[PDB]
Amino acid sequence: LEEAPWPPPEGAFVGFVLSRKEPMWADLLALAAARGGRVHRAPEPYKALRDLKEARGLLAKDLSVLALREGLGLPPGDDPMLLAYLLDPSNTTPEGVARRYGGEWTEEAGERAALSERLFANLWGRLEGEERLLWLYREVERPLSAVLAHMEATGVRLDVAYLRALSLEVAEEIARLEAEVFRLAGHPFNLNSRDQLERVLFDELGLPAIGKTEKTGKRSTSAAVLEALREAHPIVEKILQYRELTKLKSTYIDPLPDLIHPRTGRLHTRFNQTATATGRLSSSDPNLQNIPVRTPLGQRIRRAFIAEEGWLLVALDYSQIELRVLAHLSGDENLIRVFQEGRDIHTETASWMFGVPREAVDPLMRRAAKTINFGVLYGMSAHRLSQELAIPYEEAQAFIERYFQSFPKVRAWIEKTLEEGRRRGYVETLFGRRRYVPDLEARVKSVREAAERMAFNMPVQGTAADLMKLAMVKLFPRLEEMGARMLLQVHDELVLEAPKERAEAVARLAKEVMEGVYPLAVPLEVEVGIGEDWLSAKE
DNA sequence: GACCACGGCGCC
DNA sequence: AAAAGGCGCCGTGGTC
Ligand SMILES: O=C(CCCCCCCCCO)NCCCC#Cc1cn([C@H]2C[C@H](O)[C@@H](COP(=O)(O)OP(=O)(O)OP(=O)(O)O)O2)c(=O)[nH]c1=O
Ligand SMILES: [Mg+2]
Ligand SMILES: [Mg+2]
Ligand SMILES: [Mg+2]
Ligand SMILES: [Mg+2]
Ligand SMILES: [Mg+2]
Ligand SMILES: [Mg+2]
Structure with a gap:
């Protein structure tokens, strides 16, 4: 491209480089634009932002968020990432999209602008004739990017002083739990190390292994395994309590107060x-x-x-929501009738689970039922259900049968969805958003069946x-x-x-x-x- | 200081 | 852990 002075003409594609990935926290290191065989590089990036009418290009929303942070109403427009994601949602990174659709994601703004321009050209061409994907782009994804930019730049208020005080209280309870665990183990160790805990539970103490880990086949110490071992040794409940508290402290209580933005006084997500x-x-x-x-x-x-x-x-x-969507996709008369009558399947399942009338079901009970209801819908085993409910295997098996017997057209929709997925290579939402699932044709059953669960879930979750x-x-x-x-x-x-x-x-x-x-x-x-x-x- | 894989777990 | 699906972040362990 021919180098030309800033500013670019209207309609140009932008390229930009940030000091870090988060636009609310990033320094704008460089800014460029490309159009009509020319590349324009901004000598002063921040001042240059004021010249643009819209951010059009790869990661347009990120530039818009930075602009909004700086008090500039710069909306995001076309973004090749969105076109690529609609063609195939495995397109999730600019590195991958660039390689697939015609270029390379580099660390120079001018090259990023040029890339955005040519990727848009190519990806737009790929959506020709894809009327339903084009509708999603124009009516949903492109305008949504503008909405998301505003949400990101706005942030949410957090009571930092409250959280700092809470940290101190939780720290004291964690200390009590860890001290008990070490007493019961007979010695201290790193309780945050699942490798060290495995050895304590299963080798040093007498405890039976319940399950194995996925990639490396270690004896698992998951909450599910510990639950199964609640009655076997007093250390188990203490470990579960320790885990609950340390999870919340390390992930939320301690980190969040440190992320308040100095200018907005708020917490900003992406x-x-x-x-x-x-x-x-x-x-x-x-x-x-x-x-x-x-x-x-x-x-x-x-x-x-x-x-x-x-x-x-x-x-x-x-x-x-996903049950209502399922009713629409499958057209099951029984399920449709449930929602026309104003019934609540979560409350109903909860009534059965805890053996109480519907009026007796509290919010926690209903949450428990949602786990069960969606677990069963998307393919949970009787074994797992029996363990989580602490009922005999035979009871769990029966619940699953009646679940689907109650809504007969659901399994038919699943079978139809899987068959079309095998033929076309993809499954789709009501609006035609696609997910490719080549492992529907896998020769290994466990792989194939996992793929089937992914495949029939997608139209439901994706439509919602x-x-x-x-x-x-x-x-x-x-x-x-x-x-x-x-x-x-x-x-x-x-x-x-x-x-x-x-x-x-x-x-x-x-x-x-x-x-x-x-x-x-x-x-x-x-x-x-x-x-x-x-x-x-x-x- | 960083990356990764993993197990684990918070939410929907 | 077990034939639920979809995410991102934690600390560990190992490394670079
Ligand atoms: O918190 C729990 C477990 C509860 C404790 C276990 C037993 C304790 C018993 C103590 C007795 O004293 N469960 C998590 C509940 C939240 C959830 C969820 C899920 C949601 N979805 C999907 C399907 C769902 O339609 C959509 C939105 O989730 P929600 O909004 O929570 O569910 P909803 O819209 O179907 O129901 P609602 O909004 O009417 O409540 O996300 C899933 O696919 N899987 C889930 O596990
Ligand atoms: Mg009004
Ligand atoms: Mg809901
Ligand atoms: Mg490990
Ligand atoms: Mg992982
Ligand atoms: Mg919800
Ligand atoms: Mg799950």
């Missing part, structure tokens, strides 16, 4: 748009899609996520993901108009922040947008809560 095999988003640096909520300490941590002074959090969560993405794209401009903010997405949940005076109105509108996004053969229902913290907003 929402990765080309990261999963099914079309789900992922969240990283830090992951805010796995904040604890199940246990009492986990709940205390979730309460640290709070609204800005004068604002409230609004949390919205699709009810039984598509629906949420479409809802975000529709909702965002409405929130902007009301002065509200979209903060987080957690798969089938959104967390918004609204001025107190408008929170009730925002909650109502968001619920309606989400429920009416793309009507199915069954109603979509959305549960909504409002609160000063994330935990209180979900109750």
